[PDB]
Amino acid sequence: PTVVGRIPVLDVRPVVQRGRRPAKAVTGESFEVSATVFREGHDAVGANVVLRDPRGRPGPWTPMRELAPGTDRWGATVTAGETGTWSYTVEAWGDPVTTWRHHARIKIPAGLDTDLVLEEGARLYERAAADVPGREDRRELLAAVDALRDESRPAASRLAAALTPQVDAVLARHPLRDLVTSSDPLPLLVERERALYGAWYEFFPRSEGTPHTPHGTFRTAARRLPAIAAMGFDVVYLPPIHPIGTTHRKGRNNTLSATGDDVGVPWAIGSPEGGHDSIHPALGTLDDFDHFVTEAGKLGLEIALDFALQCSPDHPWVHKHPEWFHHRPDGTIAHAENPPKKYQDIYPIAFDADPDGLATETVRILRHWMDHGVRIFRVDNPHTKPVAFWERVIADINGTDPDVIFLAEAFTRPAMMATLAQIGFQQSYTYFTWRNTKQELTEYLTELSGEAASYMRPNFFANTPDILHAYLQHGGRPAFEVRAVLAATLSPTWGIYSGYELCENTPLREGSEEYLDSEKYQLKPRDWTRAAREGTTIAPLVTRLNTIRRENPALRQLRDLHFHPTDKEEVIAYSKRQGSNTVLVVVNLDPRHTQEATVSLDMPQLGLDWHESVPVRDELTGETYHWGRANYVRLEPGRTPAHVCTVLR
Amino acid sequence: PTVVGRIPVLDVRPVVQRGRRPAKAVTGESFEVSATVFREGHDAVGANVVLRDPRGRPGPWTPMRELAPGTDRWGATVTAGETGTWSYTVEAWGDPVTTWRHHARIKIPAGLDTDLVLEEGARLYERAAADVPGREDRRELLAAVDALRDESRPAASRLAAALTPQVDAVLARHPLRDLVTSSDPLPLLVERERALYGAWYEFFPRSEGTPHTPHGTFRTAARRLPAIAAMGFDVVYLPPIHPIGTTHRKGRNNTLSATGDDVGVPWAIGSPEGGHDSIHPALGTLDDFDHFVTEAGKLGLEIALDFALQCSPDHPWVHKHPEWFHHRPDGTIAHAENPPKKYQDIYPIAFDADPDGLATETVRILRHWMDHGVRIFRVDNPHTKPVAFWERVIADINGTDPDVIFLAEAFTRPAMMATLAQIGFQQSYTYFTWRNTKQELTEYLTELSGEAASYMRPNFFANTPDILHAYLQHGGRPAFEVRAVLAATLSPTWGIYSGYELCENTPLREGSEEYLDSEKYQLKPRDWTRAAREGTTIAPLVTRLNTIRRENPALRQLRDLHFHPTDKEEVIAYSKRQGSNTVLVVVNLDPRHTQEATVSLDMPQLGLDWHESVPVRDELTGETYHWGRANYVRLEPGRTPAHVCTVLR
Ligand SMILES: OC[C@H]1O[C@@H]2O[C@H]3[C@H](O)[C@@H](O)[C@@H](O[C@H]4[C@H](O)[C@@H](O)[C@@H](O[C@H]5[C@H](O)[C@@H](O)[C@@H](O[C@H]6[C@H](O)[C@@H](O)[C@@H](O[C@H]7[C@H](O)[C@@H](O)[C@@H](O[C@H]1[C@H](O)[C@H]2O)O[C@@H]7CO)O[C@@H]6CO)O[C@@H]5CO)O[C@@H]4CO)O[C@@H]3CO
Ligand SMILES: OC[C@H]1O[C@@H]2O[C@H]3[C@H](O)[C@@H](O)[C@@H](O[C@H]4[C@H](O)[C@@H](O)[C@@H](O[C@H]5[C@H](O)[C@@H](O)[C@@H](O[C@H]6[C@H](O)[C@@H](O)[C@@H](O[C@H]7[C@H](O)[C@@H](O)[C@@H](O[C@H]1[C@H](O)[C@H]2O)O[C@@H]7CO)O[C@@H]6CO)O[C@@H]5CO)O[C@@H]4CO)O[C@@H]3CO
Ligand SMILES: OC[C@H]1O[C@H](O[C@H]2[C@H](O)[C@@H](O)[C@@H](O)O[C@@H]2CO)[C@H](O)[C@@H](O)[C@@H]1O
Ligand SMILES: OC[C@H]1O[C@H](O[C@H]2[C@H](O)[C@@H](O)[C@@H](O)O[C@@H]2CO)[C@H](O)[C@@H](O)[C@@H]1O
Hints:
hexosyltransferase activity (chains A, B); TIM Barrel; 27% helix; Immunoglobulin-like; transferase (chains A, B); GlgE_dom_N/S (chains A, B); binds a molecule of 6 linked components (GLC-GLC-GLC-GLC-GLC-GLC); eight-stranded parallel beta barrel; alpha/beta; homodimer; EC 2.4.99.16 (chains A, B); 4 domains; binds a molecule of 2 linked components (GLC-GLC); Methane Monooxygenase Hydroxylase, Chain G, domain 1; GlgE (chains A, B)
């Protein structure tokens, strides 16, 4: 057996890990399958994609086209259906009819061998006719065969009868394919919509309490849910809900020693009261949690729980499984670190003495929470545990429960970030927060919407408890408005951490990305009512963004994205499409100064001619414009951060 | 069972066809193996390359280094030995000693836990000692262990005793490696020196005849061999040596109808006198050929025969194997083409009726010529026969005869060119002749010396019978001098077609790359003696170039190559290295005007400091200079094309 087939079909993409891990999609998502296809000699080739579902059934006729002239790179768009493990193959073949046609068009006017040429075409068309199941379509091709062979008619007339639109239409649907050659199948893991698309809201239940009982419970924290669903979110991400240790507990503002009433950091998991399978007694009981989850569901909210594989010094594991920790020679366990950040309040796990015990327990924990309706886990700092540990765990859980979604909070280097997604994390946190210029934003989203989309699905949290960017610190409310538009229009999954709406932007100190008086170390009650009546919240903008996303398929996908040029460095423009839905966005990245610019649209990239002028609606205001090749915009910070326009049908 | 190992080692390179075809080397050739290596958490990793020979034996300790900070990309150089099929693995591991050292250097001055830290280092070094086979080296590490544990000594003193050069030296050779993880093996095909390195001379024996018998024979053509060996060539490439057909024979200057004396084109193979396994009767017999090959061998010349899988209309195959041709409905066979070039004098082979019969016969033919000492085949237009056909043929021939070398004359698109090498062609013709500007030359050689060197070995023919470039037509002798220098210094294989030395540069007409009165269609006798006495030949330059190549290992490899900047667009500078041999070349690409420029050497890329001034010798003249960071040159066309300098040790 040779490595190349009769008709070379090489380097099929997408490919992950040389085919050892699957490429990714979700239900209804489209993406481009490509390959390098060519043949010996000078005759024409064709190619098509054969997409096979989990039961092995082939999809529709999906012909490919060469993507640029002389490159021999071919592509076609395919669309995932139901969830599960799919496969894709590229078939390449000689296209003798295209070849003949080319030669005929030249030879026949030139009077060169007209009878031999026309007979050769007749025999090609007959072979094509012998495969066509339709009787009418067969009749049509035999009628052309007859015409081609009618030696009483003029050459150019005979030929023209084989080149009619209705002959072309038959041949486009049922082409004569010589020497069909296939690649080896590549795998596609198709998952549920939410893996790609969803809006996320993070908050700490404990901060939503009362004057009598400041430490909120699941019963009191439930009252925040309706407001969260009303802002248009689909997922509520909770920090750790377990008991919190006392030894080395952190006080307010990341101070080393807690005082008597300090609540500590939820990520310092575990005490004599319980570990990762338990509920912090101040939040209530498992039954209260079930109530929280039921009420979330009725509002169309799924819960994502935080999963942090680490322990406070008081976690039961410390004495029950000492070999899950690395001990120094005096028996002590060094506290966890991410230099120059220190986590004095927790111990890191050691994985190499009892990897089987750790796997078994981890998945029991996850299954416990799964039995209570948590189908989405936000995994804390996954890059500080072994990659192969996550690979085995996710495989074990998705083996019985494929719907479960894991989000990797890996703010680390590219290689680890990529690899974590490739070994099975459905979603990933990203570098979004550190992309604020037009050049940074354009470069990064080109990367994320390109080849990386075959393995990574990004979750653009405009802020987190650990990340308050200088852009927001220095920008104020207009900056919060911009970042919200960007996140919500550039990724089909975005998120905010509670307080973002209120434009909280006081840092711990100059040049830090920590908040001052961070909610990680203290209860942080918020006057939601006042903010709403005094209009000091960007909650209405947030709500509108999620509505626009729910109303526009283009914003619920990642891969179709194009950046259109402008004459201003502060002003950025882009478009996204899904079927006939097209969304066009123009953002002023300057939060302090009004910017006026000219936006030059790539009209073909919108599916229009250059001279066309088509109507749009700015969905933020309801206002209408007529836009084309070049357009003046004027964006005043505070009044408008951006135009988020749909192209009107 | 997981795809990722305990310590991630990913995307090992070189890789060809995802591991389905081997990466390439020759004996004594060095190249970089790389991989992406990292781990969970913050501790250090290390990595090494394990090269395994055909009998499975591991090479030496070959430690890798990260190639750029923060990239997680690691590399080391390896060197191929004997010929055959090898394998390479990258091993990745935790490097606990580097990690410990880092922490110690900080903690010990800071007075933090000095006893615990020093004991932890002691126990690492003890484990390191248990692996070390050397007794002296073991003693050295245990002495450090003792020092580290000597609680009577100052902390910083204890530490310093574990960081001495002689401790480092032991640890560099025998490191403590945690959690060793390997990539899956990748294949390497190591072939003989001539596959990469060699100088080629093409001529037509029939042109070297006598006044009585103008049509030269193998006996008369042999007289040219001594002069070819004296110019320093290693390989003589002969056009087809078989009988030439009569039907549709071409006349002089590619005219359609031959007249009574016209000899025709050697590529129009076959007549009633014989086919591809026969000798043209006007060249003599097989015994005469044996004499030619024997005399070539005594002069250190190997012969490459042309292999052109195509027929004249009078080849016996036409009636013996009609199913090896495609016949039109009237029974005729369309003559071969490469549009807009037509080959009326030959029929192309059809491969799909009797592929097995074509394979069997092709390899019998090659083996015939092999039994007569032809161990190199120049394959004519391989891209017009199926890629899998070439794969099967080369594999069959190299299966029994691994020393045989095949050169692909595929002047075609990148995909086919790349693939033909990857399926087993040892060498390839290239775009060299159409790369004449500094930008073209720099770009193309960066490509050839980069990733493509894992599968493709280039053969830079400065001219061929089918390619007389405009640069030579418009440049005259100074152009010939430049192109020679380039070809000979940029590739470890180069070549010329007879008459190049005489600066023959008259095209068929303006804007053609054909020679006027081309040797393909006529006997072309040359007064070699007169040209030598009158100095109208660049044979002395050619000879000097081949001597320089024979005297300098740097020019017998491809992959080590760097372009140094200059302030003149017409002047190009580059360097190549192999061990302590460094060659530096500066060429004036302008054949009409003197050019003066400043050449700014990347001194580190030469292995020197910026301020250093190294002596060089221009090997073309014998003159000596002292060169460094910035150097004035002045290059007068006709007097000097280039400086070809060796850096003096
Ligand atoms: O006949 C049309 C063509 O004519 C002229 O081209 C010259 C050229 O200027 C000469 O130097 C020489 O070209 C060499 C190249 O130097 C050499 O690299 C190689 O070419 C290969 C390319 O390097 C490789 O990329 C590929 O080319 C593709 C290419 O990527 C595509 O873009 C596409 O090319 C089109 C051109 O864009 C288009 O403008 C025109 O080209 C003119 C050109 O302007 C003019 O100066 O047509 C082509 C579309 O067919 O297609 C090609 C694939 O065919 O592969 C090629 C080699 O196949 O080899 C050539 C010559 O052997 O010679 C040409 C004239 O022969
Ligand atoms: O001196 C340290 C460092 O401090 C400052 O970094 C800022 C930065 O300006 C902020 O925007 C943000 O950084 C983000 C990045 O925006 C984000 O991309 C990501 O960074 C990743 C990179 O994308 C990726 O390339 C890789 O980084 C490697 C890098 O390729 C290496 O070249 C090497 O970088 C060195 C730099 O040459 C040097 O400038 C300095 O870095 C500064 C930085 O200039 C400055 O603005 O030192 C490093 C050598 O340590 O190393 C890194 C790997 O460490 O992976 C990173 C992943 O981090 O994420 C960061 C935030 O993590 O925040 C930082 C504040 O630290
Ligand atoms: O109590 C443990 C630890 O939690 C925090 O750090 C988290 C952080 O919030 C996550 O976003 C990510 O960086 O992982 C960290 C560890 O789980 C606190 O900020 C930290 O001070 C605290 O010690
Ligand atoms: O005899 C056929 C054909 O020979 C020449 O074309 C060659 C060319 O020289 C080869 O090196 C390569 O390109 O393939 C061709 C045929 O094998 C002549 O140039 C041409 O006129 C002639 O028809």
